[PDB]
């Protein structure tokens, strides 16, 4: 049978000498699809294992004194932190690029662009750009609802004027996500119950310029729900994006699941959603319509990234399989019109994203 998405296996890290207690959210980071960095405990010389994804047979192992190591999303430039000490290193030049010591402990950090690491302490969120002697500037202060939570994500939009911090707490058999959405233009935040999110740029039809869309999924309490909403005032000449709110189905076998990860393709205008028990969901970004729903992994996929070559999502599970799911481009429109029995959505995604299969009217 002809399916709307395509699966690929890239690596299994256990074949390169990675012990799976170090395959986890604490010790493995994958900021983009170019590199994987594994904090490793061998003997007790604490080392880091850096996998080039364009050369996976030759990883490099170097000793560290850091509690977290994140790779730059484009270059082989590592960021290492110990408590309040932060350092930025070029690996191919063996040079320290930058260094800064904060007043507080940085509990979470993530590259948000090509040259900016974002820094999360217990009370504030900082943006540290790598240009020159640029020191971390403060974006916003943290909200009451994210205190005492495990911070799992921080995502911005492309203009970096809409920021979102995402943490989780354990409230009675159930992982409750708390998100702080902050705008730097109105200097105001909002607490949202939310589990996984991403931002997107989306030019509507009949329209001059792109909407900036905020998409998040929650297993809140009514159930699983997915919301797609425009943030900010629309530009002038731009009709506003109509608010989308659809259901996220969870099966009765997996009624302790919740979403953990989200990437949005802009080549196809779709939303990839992965849950904790290893389920992939594919939605349409314009309408919210569920295209596909099935289970990619037996184990927990804890880290994801955009897949740039296929316009998809790449993720690592707890066993160590590096997997990728993308839109199968010659199959998705015949899947929507005949298996999903939706000729209208198949017509719309064939005109909007230049997909084949628009000769069956």
């Amino acid at each position: 049978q002809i399916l709307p998405i395509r699966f690929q296996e890239h690596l299994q890290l256990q074949n390169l000498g990675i012990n799976p207690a170090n395959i986890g959210f604490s010790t493995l980071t994958m900021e983009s699809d170019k590199f994987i960095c594994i904090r490793e405990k061998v003997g007790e010389q604490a080392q880091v294992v850096i996998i080039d994804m364009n050369d996976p047979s030759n990883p490099i192992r170097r000793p560290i004194s850091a509690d977290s190591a994140i790779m730059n999303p484009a270059s082989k430039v590592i960021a290492l932190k110990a408590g309040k000490t932060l350092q930025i290193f070029n690996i191919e030049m063996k040079s320290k690029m930058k260094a800064h010591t904060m007043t507080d402990d940085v509990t979470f950090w993530k590259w948000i662009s090509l040259n900016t690491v974002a820094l999360v302490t217990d009370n504030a969120v900082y943006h540290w750009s790598m240009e020159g002697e640029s020191q971390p500037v403060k974006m916003f202060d943290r909200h009451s609802s994210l205190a005492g939570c495990q911070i799992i994500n921080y995502r911005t939009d492309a203009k970096q004027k809409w920021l979102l911090l995402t943490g989780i707490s354990a409230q009675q058999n159930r992982v409750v996500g708390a998100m702080q959405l902050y705008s730097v233009d109105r200097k105001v935040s909002q607490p949202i119950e939310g589990h996984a999110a991403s931002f997107a740029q989306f030019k509507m039809e009949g329209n001059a310029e792109e909407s900036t869309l905020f998409c998040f999924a929650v297993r809140g309490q009514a159930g699983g729900k997915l919301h797609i909403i425009e943030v900010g005032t629309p530009p002038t000449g731009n009709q506003p994006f109509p608010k989308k709110a659809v259901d996220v189905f969870f099966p009765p076998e997996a009624q302790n699941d919740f979403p953990v990860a989200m990437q949005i393709s802009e080549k196809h205008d779709v939303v990839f959603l992965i849950t904790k028990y290893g389920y992939i969901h594919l939605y349409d970004l314009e309408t919210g319509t569920c295209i596909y729903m099935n289970r990619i992994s037996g184990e927990t996929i804890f880290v994801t990234a955009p897949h740039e070559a296929t316009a998809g999502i790449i993720g690592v599970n707890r066993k160590g399989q590096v997997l990728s799911v993308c839109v199968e481009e010659e199959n998705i429109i015949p899947y929507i019109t005949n298996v999903l029995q939706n000729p209208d959505l198949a017509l719309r995604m064939a005109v909007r994203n230049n997909l084949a299969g628009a000769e069956e009217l």
């Binding site: 290193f89 105001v188 909002q190």
Partner: peptide
């Protein structure tokens, strides 16, 4: 400051309305 590698409270308002 030795190298970490060896190579050798806010304003709350409504930004978005989520009620359909």
């Amino acid at each position: 400051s030795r190298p970490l590698i060896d190579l050798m409270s806010p304003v709350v308002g409504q930004l978005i309305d989520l009620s359909s």
